[PDB]
Amino acid sequence: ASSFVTISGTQFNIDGKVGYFAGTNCYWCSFLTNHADVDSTFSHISSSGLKVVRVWGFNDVNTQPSPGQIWFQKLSATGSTINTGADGLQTLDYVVQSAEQHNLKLIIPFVNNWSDYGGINAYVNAFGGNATTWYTNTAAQTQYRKYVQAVVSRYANSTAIFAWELGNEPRCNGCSTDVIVQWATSVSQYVKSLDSNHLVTLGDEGLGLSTGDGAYPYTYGEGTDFAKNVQIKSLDFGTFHLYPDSWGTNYTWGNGWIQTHAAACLAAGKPCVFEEYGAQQNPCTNEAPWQTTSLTTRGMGGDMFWQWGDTFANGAQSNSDPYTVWYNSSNWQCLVKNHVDAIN
Ligand SMILES: *[C@@H]1O[C@H](CO)[C@@H](O)[C@H](O)[C@H]1NC(C)=O
Ligand SMILES: *[C@@H]1O[C@H](CO)[C@@H](O)[C@H](O)[C@H]1NC(C)=O
Ligand SMILES: *[C@@H]1O[C@H](CO)[C@@H](O)[C@H](O)[C@H]1NC(C)=O
Ligand SMILES: *[C@H]1O[C@H](CO)[C@@H](O)[C@H](O)[C@H]1NC(C)=O
């Protein structure tokens, strides 16, 4: 079957099947000029047994790139431009079309907290203020909401969308936690007014939760409160991320991070998705136990590692980083095939 993704009780329902899912992150899948390169990559993800892919819904600039290069939006105080041309949102159309053809679903965020592919910083350059006042800057929010309608209106009736996502890792450093609560309540109400067929989520890392061991990620210095955010009425499920080598914690601490978040999602009546994770050293040894903890914890509906790597018909390879898991490699055997086999 081919249907809209919904919630069934405490779990997800994907094409009529209720139960736990595995997926992957592929930010770079959105910025390909040859659609055959998107299609070969999605053929590999589908034959591996994965069901969901996370891809970027943004590409923000203050000055247009070299002719031929991709850009989705140009931010300016004298009038901004949304690009629906061949070198614009048509490359994101390639990804939604490929998902329909290979039986996959997509999670899509609308802006980045970080400055990669523009982010909040590109809005700051155009409209003034700073990274924490962005949430309440009138001109910046008016343009963000126009960008949300331009993306949602293309795909609101496609069965390939898993969920819309407000941003990639939203933070408000040192702020009251109410700034993000009020912003997210208003923006998620707006997305639901444009599309009643699909689910909606925040995209946060999961910071700020009092049931943990007190390490920095559990404290309240980045403007977020996990229990308060997951109880917002117009959000349908919780998200959280995990990077111990950047956070100053050890690898085994990740199991407790998964368990506390899963319980907070279930106390709010909803599932959680373990949406982005990686270890810089020995990934097969250190990430495999995390995968088993998520599969066997009540309140967890799925997980997606960072990140997929692949190669094309011309012999070139995709964008890569220290966390890349290359298709058909020894780390694909340990973290993709073996995990899919344990789910079914
Ligand atoms: C950003 O702007 C507001 C002032 O309008 C200020 O309260 C806050 O301290 C500033 N942030 C930084 C990092 O300086
Ligand atoms: C598309 O989905 C909307 C709900 O978001 C629905 O009201 C509308 O009828 C659908 N369009 C078609 C052509 O069926
Ligand atoms: C992947 O490996 C299988 C052998 O296990 C092979 O048949 C297939 O052609 C390979 N695909 C790629 C893209 O390397
Ligand atoms: C490290 O972290 C936890 C506390 O955060 C500690 O209880 C555990 O024994 C340690 N794990 C390893 C293997 O270092």
Swiss-Prot record:
Organism superkingdom: Eukaryota
Could you say which EC number(s) this protein's record lists?
3.2.1.78
What is the official name of this protein in its record?
Answer: Mannan endo-1,4-beta-mannosidase A
Can you tell me which residues are glycosylated?
N130, N157, N250, N328
Q: How does it assemble?
A: Monomer.
The organism's lineage is: Eukaryota, Fungi, Dikarya, Ascomycota, Pezizomycotina
Question: In the UniProt entry, which residues are flagged as the active site?
Answer: E169, E276
Describe the task this protein carries out.
Answer: Endo-1,4-mannanase that catalyzes the random hydrolysis of (1->4)-beta-D-mannosidic linkages in mannans and heteromannans. It is a crucial enzyme for depolymerization of seed galactomannans and wood galactoglucomannans. Active against locust bean gum and ivory nut mannan, releasing mainly tri- and disaccharides. Also has transglycosylation activity. Transglycosylation of two mannotrioses into a mannohexaose is the major transglycosylation route.
Which keywords annotate this record? Disulfide bond, Glycoprotein, Glycosidase, Hydrolase, Secreted, Signal
- Recorded GO MF terms: cellulose binding; disaccharide binding; mannan endo-1,4-beta-mannosidase activity
UniProt effect for mutating R171K: Shows an altered product profile, producing mannotriose and mannose from mannotetraose, compared to predominantly mannobiose in the wild type
Per the record, what are the reactions this protein catalyses? Random hydrolysis of (1->4)-beta-D-mannosidic linkages in mannans, galactomannans and glucomannans
What pH-related activity note exists for this entry?
Answer: Optimum pH is 5.0. Stable from pH 2.5 to 7.0.
Give the organism the record lists: Hypocrea jecorina (strain ATCC 56765 / BCRC 32924 / NRRL 11460 / Rut C-30)
Q: Give yes or no: UniProt keyword Protein biosynthesis.
A: no
Q: List the disulfide bonds.
A: C26-C29, C172-C175, C265-C272, C284-C334
Family, per the entry? Belongs to the glycosyl hydrolase 5 (cellulase A) family.
Q: What gene name is given for the protein in this entry?
A: man1
Task: Site Important for transglycosylation activity: list residues.
Answer: R171
Entry note about domains: The enzyme consists of two functional domains, a catalytic core joined to a carbohydrate-binding domain (CBM) by a serine-, threonine-, and proline-rich, highly glycosylated linker sequence. The CBM binds to cellulose but not to mannan, and increases the mannan-hydrolysis of complex substrates.
Where are the stretches annotated Catalytic?
1-344
- Name the residues that bind substrate: E169, P170, R171, E205, W247
- Record field: temperature dependence: Optimum temperature is 75 degrees Celsius.
